[PDB]
Design an enzyme around this catalytic site. Sequence first.
Site, PDB file in Angstrom:
ATOM      1  N   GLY A   1     -10.924  56.867  30.180  1.00  0.00           N
ATOM      2  CA  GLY A   1     -10.132  56.111  31.128  1.00  0.00           C
ATOM      3  C   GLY A   1      -8.906  55.451  30.539  1.00  0.00           C
TER       4      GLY A   1
ATOM      5  N   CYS B   1      -6.485  57.253  28.861  1.00  0.00           N
ATOM      6  CA  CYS B   1      -5.369  58.187  28.857  1.00  0.00           C
ATOM      7  C   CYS B   1      -4.254  57.681  29.762  1.00  0.00           C
ATOM      8  CB  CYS B   1      -5.836  59.571  29.301  1.00  0.00           C
ATOM      9  SG  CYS B   1      -6.932  60.372  28.115  1.00  0.00           S
TER      10      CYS B   1
ATOM     11  N   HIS C   1      -2.874  66.391  32.858  1.00  0.00           N
ATOM     12  CA  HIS C   1      -4.244  66.829  33.097  1.00  0.00           C
ATOM     13  C   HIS C   1      -5.009  65.895  34.029  1.00  0.00           C
ATOM     14  CE1 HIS C   1      -4.998  64.166  29.497  1.00  0.00           C
ATOM     15  NE2 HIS C   1      -5.989  63.787  30.284  1.00  0.00           N
TER      16      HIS C   1
END
Lengths: 301, 301
Positions: free
Chosen positions: A143, A145, A41
Amino acid sequence: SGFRKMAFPSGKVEGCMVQVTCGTTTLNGLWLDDVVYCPRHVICTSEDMLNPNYEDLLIRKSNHNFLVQAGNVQLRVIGHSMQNCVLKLKVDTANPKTPKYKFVRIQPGQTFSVLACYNGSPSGVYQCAMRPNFTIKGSFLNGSCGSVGFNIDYDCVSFCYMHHMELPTGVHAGTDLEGNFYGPFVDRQTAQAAGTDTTITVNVLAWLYAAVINGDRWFLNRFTTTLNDFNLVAMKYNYEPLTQDHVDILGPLSAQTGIAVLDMCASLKELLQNGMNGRTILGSALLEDEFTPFDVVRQCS
Amino acid sequence: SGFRKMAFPSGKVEGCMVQVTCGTTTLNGLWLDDVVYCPRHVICTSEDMLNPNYEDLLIRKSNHNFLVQAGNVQLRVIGHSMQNCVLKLKVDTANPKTPKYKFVRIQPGQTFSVLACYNGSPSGVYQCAMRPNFTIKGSFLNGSCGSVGFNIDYDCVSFCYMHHMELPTGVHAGTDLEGNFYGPFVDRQTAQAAGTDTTITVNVLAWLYAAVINGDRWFLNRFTTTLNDFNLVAMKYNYEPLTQDHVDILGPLSAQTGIAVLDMCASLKELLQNGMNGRTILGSALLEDEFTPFDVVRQCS
Ligand SMILES: *[C@](O)(C(N)=O)[C@H](CC1CCC1)NC(=O)[C@@H]1[C@@H]2[C@H](CN1C(=O)[C@@H](NC(=O)NC(C)(C)C)C(C)(C)C)C2(C)C
Ligand SMILES: *[C@](O)(C(N)=O)[C@H](CC1CCC1)NC(=O)[C@@H]1[C@@H]2[C@H](CN1C(=O)[C@@H](NC(=O)NC(C)(C)C)C(C)(C)C)C2(C)C
C-alpha cells in the site's frame, strides 16, 4: 553538534498526496497542479502483473474507473494517459497546495527524503540514498507504492523518486516522476537481478569528516596516500574510485577541519585493511556511505 | 518490508515554528494559539548564563525586547510570563495553523520526532529516544534551541520536548512544554553531569522482532530463559531489567513472529555474551535500542 540521518521537512509534500484506486488495488498518487501521478500497475490485477501488456490493459479503463481521493474529497478524473511507467490522471480541480516543484533524475550516490504513505495518508519520513546499482534501502509495506522521494531547495520541492516494487533483502526500486525506472528494472513480477552494489567512497569520506567535526578522531593516522594508491585499495573492497571532482566537492569539509582529503583517504585505507577493531564512529560500528558532502555541511553548518 | 528510523510527518508542526530574538540571542519558538513558547534563557546575555537569576532578568525585560518573526511577518508581543524554564510570550495574533495538540511528558525509553529548526525555519526531522538518564542523542547547532519533539496520535499532535542545552559527546537535554527539565539538569552554564546511561531492553527486543519480521533470523537459538534469569545477564551488561509489563507489551510482535518473548530474551542473552561475530542485524553491527514496540508495529503493519 551531534550527527543524525535527517530528512527534509515533509510539509510541502504532505498536501500533494492523494489516494488512487482502480478496481482491486489502492495506492498513493502525487497531486500536482491538475495532474495526479501514480504507478501504472494500479490498473493491474494480481494475475496481470505476471506478464502485463499495459497498453491493452489501460485501453480497458476509462476515466470513471479511477477513484481519486484527497482526504475525504473526491477528485473527478477527466483524462488519463501513460508516460513510461507512470499513470497521469487529469483532474477537474487544481491542487491549491501545489508548491514550486521540479522533476529531477538524481545521480547514484545522492540522497533524498522519502515520505512513506499508505492509502493516500502520509505515515513517516526518512532519508535514502540512490545506490550505485540504482536501488534504495527504504521501508515500504503493501500500500506504499506511489510514495515519493524529494529534496528541498529554499521552497522548491525537487521530486526524484516514486516507489514501485520490492527486491530481496529490503531492497526497493522505482522511477523518476517521468516514469523512467532507475536501473534495469521493469514493472513486471518476474525474476530480476540488481547489479553488484559498491560503496560510495566520497560519502564515506564526508561521513569521516563529520566524525572529526564532532570530536571523533581516533581513526586519524600519520600516513598519506596518492589517488592511484588509494583507488587500488578502494576497488579491492568494492569502493567507488575517487576522482579529483570528488576531492573538490570535499573542499568545504577539508577546509573546516584542516585535514587534507588525501590524508583522510589514508585513514580510510587503514580502516578497510585493518577493520574498526570493535570501535565506533559517530555511534556506528560500520562505515556509513549514505551521507553526501552536502548532507554533512547542512548538519555541521 | 525494510526497517528504517522513521519520524512522523512534520507538516502540522512546521506551521507552528517562529523565530524569537531578544538582543544578542536568537532561537526558535512554538506558536500555539496565541502563545509563543521558547526557552527562557533567550533573555540572557552570554555573561548572564553563567549564573542567571531569571526572576531578576525577566523583570528587566520589556515586551519590545522580544522580536518574534513568523516568516516575514513580525508578531506583536502583548505580554510575557515564565513557567518553570519556558518563556510564554502572548501575541496579538492567534496562529491560524494551530493543530489539535496536547502537552505530554514522556517516559524514559519512549521515542519522538524532532523538527530541527534554525532562526524559526524548519531544517530537518529525525527520530530520538528519551534515554534512561533523561537525555537525547539529537543533532542541534547553535540557533536550534526551541526546536520541539512530538508524536502524532491522531489529527492530534503530542508535544513532548523542547531543546535547551548541549552535553559532551553529542548529548542533549531539554524540557517538556511546561518548562520542566527532563532529568537533573538546570538551565545554567555550569558543570553538570548526566547519569550513567543504560540500554532500553524492551526496545532491543522489539528491534530483534523487526529483524525476524524482515527475514533476519541468524541470532535465534533454541535455548530459553526465565524473566528472573535473563535480568541477571542484563544487569551485567548495563541493560534495564525486563518486567512482565514489558513482556505483555511485546505481545503483538511475539504473536506475529510466532516467537515467545522469553525465547527472544535467550537469543539476546547470547548476543550480549558471545557478541555478534562481525555480522549485521538489519544493517547494523550494534544492538539498537531506539525503536519502541510501537515503532516496530508501525513499520511492520
Ligand atoms: C505496490 O504496488 C503497493 N500496492 O504498495 C506494491 C508493493 C509490494 C510490496 C508488497 C506489494 N508493488 C508491487 O506489487 C509490484 C507490482 C507487481 C510486482 N511487485 C512487487 O513488489 C513484487 N516484487 C518482485 O516481483 N521483485 C522481483 C521483480 C522478482 C525482483 C512482490 C513479490 C514484492 C509483490 C509489480 C508490477 C512490480
Ligand atoms: C541554544 O540556546 C541555541 N542558541 O540554540 C543554545 C544551544 C547551544 C549549542 C551551542 C549553543 N543553548 C545554550 O546555549 C545553553 C544556554 C546556556 C548554556 N547552554 C549550552 O548549551 C552549554 N552547554 C553546557 O553548559 N553543558 C554543561 C552544563 C556544562 C554540561 C554550551 C557550553 C553548549 C553553550 C544554557 C542556559 C544551558
